[PDB]
Design a protein around this ligand. Structure first.
Ligand SMILES: Cn1nc(-c2cccs2)cc1N
Length: 284
């Protein structure tokens, strides 16, 4: 079926939970043996969220190459993404090592450091220009260059230096600051505006390594971001945009990381975002 009318048909019939459970039943199951080794327990935020072995990102280190991160490679859309958990106190250095080694331009953050009165990820970037951060375990230096605070999101320019070679690179940090503590946003308008700002920066384009995207577990909000982006790109590429099937795209993405889209409300929100976003692209 088309998307917008499949949407009204699920709303009127109140069957979002049943649609979402079908997806969960059909989703791929692949081994994640490296994630579950005992030496990696303090590298995982949640015991039930792990990268598959076949698609995990490897750190370029011979001691321990493990990070909780997956490469989502979308062949028809010609887009790639790295989805990862919010960094932990003992993985902030690994996180920036990955950004460096994979040649990423942008980092997309969809959570606040504290939500619901608890810590959802480490404070992994510097908050003042004159107070830079040094990660001694991976030999990197990170400096805040500039910061632009808007009503729904903040963009930061960061300088990452590889202290071993003295090479430097500019990284863009896109921080969506207004996702609610419970539920999903009422309107997708600010999320779509944010997605378009990431796109306009070059961070999603083939001349760079894959964008790094995260929330707390790296599957829920993060899944919503890449699902909406890929669906809108396919609608631009194809002769028949109504042929884009969001449930099929989501199942393709779940071949590469488990659990993408965590609730039936996130699924409904993803439909809403793609539907509204397709009107703004055109041709309007
Ligand atoms: C002056 N300047 N500007 C930068 C960055 C630009 C864009 C991202 S980071 C780094 C330095 N040293």
């Amino acid at each position: 079926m088309e998307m917008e009318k499949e949407f009204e048909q699920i709303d009127k019939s109140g069957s979002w939970a049943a649609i979402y459970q079908d997806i969960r039943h059909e989703a791929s199951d692949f081994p994640s043996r490296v994630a579950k080794l005992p030496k990696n327990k303090n590298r995982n935020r949640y015991r039930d969220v792990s990268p598959f072995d076949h698609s995990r990102i490897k750190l370029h280190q011979e001691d321990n190459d493990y990070i909780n991160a997956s490469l989502i490679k979308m062949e028809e859309a010609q887009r790639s993404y790295i989805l990862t958990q919010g960094p932990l106190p003992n993985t902030v250095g690994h996180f920036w090592e990955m950004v460096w080694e994979q040649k990423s331009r942008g980092v997309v953050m969809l959570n606040r450091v504290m939500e619901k009165g608890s810590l959802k990820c480490a404070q992994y970037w510097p908050q003042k220009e004159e107070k830079e951060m040094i990660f001694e375990d991976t030999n990197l230096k990170l400096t805040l260059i500039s910061e632009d605070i808007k009503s729904y999101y903040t963009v930061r320019q960061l300088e990452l230096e590889n202290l071993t070679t003295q090479e430097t690179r500019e990284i863009l940090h896109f921080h969506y600051t207004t996702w609610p503590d419970f539920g999903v946003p009422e309107s997708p308008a600010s999320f779509l505006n944010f997605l378009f700002k990431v796109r306009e920066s070059g961070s999603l384009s083939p001349e760079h390594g894959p964008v790094v995207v995260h929330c707390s577990a790296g599957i829920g909000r993060s899944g919503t971001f890449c699902l909406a982006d890929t669906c809108l790109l396919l609608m631009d590429k194809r002769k028949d945009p109504s042929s884009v099937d969001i449930k099929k795209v989501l199942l393709e993405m779940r071949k590469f990381r488990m659990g993408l889209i965590q609730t039936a409300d996130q699924l409904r929100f993803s439909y809403l975002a793609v539907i509204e976003g397709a009107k703004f692209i055109m041709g309007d």
